[PDB]
Design a binder for this molecule. Structure first.
Ligand SMILES: *C(=C)C1=C(C)[C@@H](Cc2[nH]c(/C=C3N=C(/C=C4\NC(=O)[C@H](C)[C@H]4[C@@H](*)C)C(C)=C\3CCC(=O)O)c(CCC(=O)O)c2C)NC1=O
Ligand SMILES: *C(=C)C1=C(C)[C@@H](Cc2[nH]c(/C=C3N=C(/C=C4\NC(=O)[C@H](C)[C@H]4[C@@H](*)C)C(C)=C\3CCC(=O)O)c(CCC(=O)O)c2C)NC1=O
Ligand SMILES: *C(=C)C1=C(C)[C@@H](Cc2[nH]c(/C=C3N=C(/C=C4\NC(=O)[C@H](C)[C@H]4[C@@H](*)C)C(C)=C\3CCC(=O)O)c(CCC(=O)O)c2C)NC1=O
Ligand SMILES: *[C@@H](C)[C@H]1/C(=C/C2=NC(=C\c3[nH]c(C[C@H]4NC(=O)C(C=C)=C4C)c(C)c3CCC(=O)O)/C(CCC(=O)O)=C2C)NC(=O)[C@@H]1C
Ligand SMILES: *[C@@H](C)[C@H]1/C(=C/C2=NC(=C\c3[nH]c(C[C@H]4NC(=O)C(C=C)=C4C)c(C)c3CCC(=O)O)/C(CCC(=O)O)=C2C)NC(=O)[C@@H]1C
Ligand SMILES: *[C@@H](C)[C@H]1/C(=C/C2=NC(=C\c3[nH]c(C[C@H]4NC(=O)C(C=C)=C4C)c(C)c3CCC(=O)O)/C(CCC(=O)O)=C2C)NC(=O)[C@@H]1C
Ligand SMILES: *[C@H](C)[C@H]1/C(=C/C2=NC(=C\c3[nH]c(C[C@H]4NC(=O)C(C=C)=C4C)c(C)c3CCC(=O)O)/C(CCC(=O)O)=C2C)NC(=O)[C@@H]1C
Ligand SMILES: *[C@H](C)[C@H]1/C(=C/C2=NC(=C\c3[nH]c(C[C@H]4NC(=O)C(C=C)=C4C)c(C)c3CCC(=O)O)/C(CCC(=O)O)=C2C)NC(=O)[C@@H]1C
Ligand SMILES: *[C@H](C)[C@H]1/C(=C/C2=NC(=C\c3[nH]c(C[C@H]4NC(=O)C(C=C)=C4C)c(C)c3CCC(=O)O)/C(CCC(=O)O)=C2C)NC(=O)[C@@H]1C
Lengths: 205, 162, 177, 177
């Protein structure tokens, strides 16, 4: 026998200021060039806009002032803000210096009545190769090398020939009188080792 | 929108002898209204730097652009109140419902009063031409009655949020 | 923890700001040695290029092995990274002198710098010698005892800021140790 | 093909030959009495470490004065060099068996050997005894008459190949004679 939502709306409407949720404010502009025929006053309701661009200038400049002030640093102890979740990868180079922050440093510039701080990515170089040329953009951008291996007599045997000998290996076909593609022979050359541990073990015996 | 000028403007000036003095006091506020609001809100943060801290109400660019809007909406009504001579439009459209709005949003009322206090200080400097950085050219005379009235209109703002 | 300024710069809101005009003069009221502190920052910043170039070259003189074949300042990029890091290290100490706070220096720059350097195989002992050379030029510049370039200053005592800067460099040495 | 094999062992810039499938069937057609020859050289290389150690251990057993002070197998360096030479000679004789001619052994191993042994003071008579043991071992493995190892072969006679291998060893003693 009661409609509560209808009562809530009617009670709210009967008291609510219509202008409070519209940001409309009266604009005044006056014209005056020193003659009685020039003077004119006009008024007009006009919605006041939020200029987000100029709000950045106040926010940036004051936060520098808030940080250089040392007595507001103790009478206003500001709060810690927890950083946003970014996944860690275990390598400290990407954990502690991510590419969003890497190489930024504060330029300080001091003039008559102006103290300015600017964070800038610091690059420097040797010859014509820059420090951050390792991380050039993609629009500015092969074979594989093999793994390397570990004399009065000289008239008779040169140093390029000494201790050099043939080397050879075999695998006969697996089955009697029958073809086998897994069968092989190999022929090669190599310098014979010193064999000094076997020579010591043989000399001891 | 309305316009008044020429012969019709002289009729409205006949109703009050300070007609030129009242109009010369609105021209010292609407000409400097951009510098006033920018300095008031900045001066509010010099005094209370916790507003641009984490959890502050002027942290993030979206909120401070709304804070800068509010000092402008407030100042435009007070400038209209001076031109009209009455507080009726100021109270009915701007101040009715403001405090109930601010408590719901979490807007700090005490620091909001500090910005209005600065603009009241900036207003009376401009009206009485006593500003230390800038001057205006005026016919010689005394506007102390009008500068007292602008102070009263700012206090209706402060009372409504207290 | 950050300060008010570096917190907005990590958010990518604004990269630069200035305090000036009347608002600078109000900042002077809340600081002792306010003209002095801005003067000591000027002595570092106006010599930032010469200081870093002196430091890494002095590291070469003190130990020639860094530009050995098989060294670590061999190839042109690693040398350029050495000059870049010495410039980066120096500019944070100049900001730490300005605000009188090591916090942004410690949280942004010094945090995890050692384990990075171990991962790169950077000789941490020689990086000490760069930042300890950079200390010596800073204290020499501030007290105006610098032999080669003399600055013009209103007279007074600057032992306090001289002792302050030596602490900041010593903190960098501790993290990089 | 067999001429290119000789270039692979002689040249210093020869790609190590791999032979399989149809190329191994081609090689089997080129070698004279191929499967017995391949089985003759397999019997040597499969025992080559035991052969060289036993042959030098044999020449020392028969003349222990070679291990006394002033003996030419005294000290580890000498013993190592003798062991090394025994394997070198065995390896070049095994290639002469693969090839069915002595030329690679004569040209690459025996030319100059006598003069080096004379210049070094290496005793040729005891060297000839080491060679004579490896002759006896090689004849035994090729004919499958070794005392402590048997290999697996199709039944037949390989005495021609054993007589040929004996001629290659007998050549080493005639070159250092
Ligand atoms: C924080 C560092 C801080 C503020 C920033 C600033 C806030 C503040 N300002 C005043 C006084 C005035 N500011 C005025 C504005 C301007 N003057 C101009 O010349 C241009 C046109 C305009 C914009 C910059 C004005 C007119 C005044 C009036 C008196 C004066 O001239 O000084 C105050 C003091 C308020 C008071 O008088 O009680 C404050 C707090 N000052 C800061 O410290
Ligand atoms: C190798 C040959 C090697 C050098 C390289 C050099 C390295 C070195 N430098 C110093 C001390 C200073 N360098 C300074 C920098 C300069 N002075 C200026 O006027 C310009 C602007 C600037 C660039 C040239 C300064 C100011 C100092 C401090 C000296 C002073 O009191 O003025 C040192 C000594 C530091 C130390 O280890 O104690 C060294 C070793 N010397 C080399 O041998
Ligand atoms: C002193 C104690 C002393 C010796 C050391 C040893 C030297 C020696 N060796 C042979 C003959 C052979 N040795 C062979 C080698 C091996 N036989 C095997 O079964 C294994 C796998 C391998 C490594 C140990 C072989 C195969 C023979 C041939 C045997 C045959 O006669 O058919 C001899 C005897 C021949 C000669 O005089 O040259 C000697 C002396 N013997 C010692 O007395
Ligand atoms: C003297 C050496 C022996 C003996 C040997 C015999 N082997 C015979 C045949 C044979 N041997 C092999 C292995 C050989 N051929 C290869 O391709 C390779 C390696 C790549 C090797 C090591 C093969 C494959 C064959 C063919 C038969 C088979 O196994 O399928 C053989 C018969 C020769 C013939 O008449 O064709 C003999 C005599 N026999 C002896 O009794 C002495 C001890
Ligand atoms: C207090 C704010 C000042 C001050 C103000 C005075 N102005 C006087 C005369 C005057 N001013 C204007 C311009 C004004 N009247 C308009 O209609 C227009 C807008 C359309 C403007 C903004 C005029 C026209 C006049 C009249 C004289 C003239 O023709 O120039 C004045 C004298 C009193 C009076 O004339 O009523 C005063 C006191 N002077 C000050 O010293 C304080 C700081
Ligand atoms: C130790 C570092 C020096 C030393 C420092 C002093 N500077 C003094 C006065 C002074 N310096 C400046 C320039 C500086 N302050 C600023 O606001 C600006 C621009 C932003 C710069 C970077 C100024 C303007 C002044 C004030 C001039 C005046 O006296 O009217 C000074 C005197 C006391 C003081 O005001 O702090 C000192 C001791 N002087 C030295 O001899 C050592 C080497
Ligand atoms: C700056 C001086 C303050 C501050 C102000 C903020 N106001 C926010 C929103 C807001 N303000 C109003 C009242 C205002 N709008 C009107 O239309 C009228 C006049 C007719 C008045 C004077 C309203 C109704 C609203 C809400 C609607 C909207 O967003 O436009 C605001 C954002 C709140 C939020 O975070 O959501 C701020 C920050 N806050 C401060 O701390 C300083 C003191
Ligand atoms: C010269 C004084 C030293 C030294 C310098 C080198 N640093 C190298 C790479 C590197 N440096 C950093 C830390 C640096 N990056 C930042 O953003 C800032 C803080 C704002 C710091 C201070 C990082 C994270 C890295 C690696 C990532 C990169 O630069 O791309 C470097 C090259 C080694 C390499 O990259 O493999 C050198 C040579 N090392 C020395 O030995 C002398 C003493
Ligand atoms: C073991 C039965 C001997 C014995 C042998 C020693 N030979 C020594 C040195 C040596 N041997 C050769 C010939 C060898 N090298 C080759 O490159 C080739 C074929 C391609 C052959 C056959 C040479 C050229 C040399 C000198 C160079 C080298 O050492 O590699 C040797 C070392 C002598 C010494 O330094 O005292 C020994 C012990 N010694 C014996 O007494 C028995 C009889």
């Amino acid at each position: 026998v009661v409609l509560p939502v209808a009562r809530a709306g009617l009670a709210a409407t009967a008291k609510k200021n219509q202008y409070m949720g519209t940001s409309v404010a009266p604009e005044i502009v006056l014209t005056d060039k020193g003659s009685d025929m020039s003077r004119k006053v006009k008024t007009e309701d006009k919605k006041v806009a939020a200029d987000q661009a100029a709000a950045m200038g106040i926010l940036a400049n004051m936060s520098l002032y808030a940080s250089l002030n040392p007595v507001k640093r103790m009478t206003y102890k500001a709060k810690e803000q927890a950083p946003a979740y970014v996944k860690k990868t275990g390598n400290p180079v990407e954990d502690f210096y991510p590419s969003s922050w890497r190489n930024m440093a504060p330029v300080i510039s001091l003039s008559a009545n102006r103290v300015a701080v600017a964070f800038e990515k610091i690059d420097a170089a040797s010859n014509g190769v820059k420090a951050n040329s390792n991380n050039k953009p993609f629009w500015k951008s092969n074979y594989v090398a093999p793994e390397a291996p570990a004399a009065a007599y000289q008239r008779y045997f040169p140093a390029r020939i000494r201790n050099k000998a043939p080397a050879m290996e075999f695998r006969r076909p697996s089955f009697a009188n029958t073809e086998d593609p897994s069968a092989y022979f190999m022929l090669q050359k190599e310098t014979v080792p010193l064999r000094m541990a076997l020579a010591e073990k043989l000399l001891t015996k | 929108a309305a316009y008044v000028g020429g012969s019709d403007l002289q009729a409205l000036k006949s109703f009050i002898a300070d007609g030129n003095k009242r109009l010369d006091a609105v021209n010292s506020i609407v000409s400097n209204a951009s510098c006033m609001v920018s300095d008031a809100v900045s001066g509010m943060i010099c005094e209370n730097p916790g507003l641009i801290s984490p959890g502050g109400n002027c942290y993030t660019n979206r909120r401070m652009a709304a804070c800068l809007r509010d000092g402008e909406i407030i100042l435009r009504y007070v400038s209209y109140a001076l031109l009209a001579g009455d507080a009726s439009v100021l109270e009915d459209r701007c101040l009715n419902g403001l405090k109930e709005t601010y408590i719901a949003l979490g807007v700090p009322t005490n620091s909001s009063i500090r910005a209005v206090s600065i603009m009241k200080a900036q207003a009376v400097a401009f009206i009485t031409n006593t500003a230390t950085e800038r001057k205006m050219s005026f016919a010689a005379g005394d506007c102390t009655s009008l500068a007292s009235e602008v102070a009263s209109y700012f206090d209706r703002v402060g009372a409504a949020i207290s």
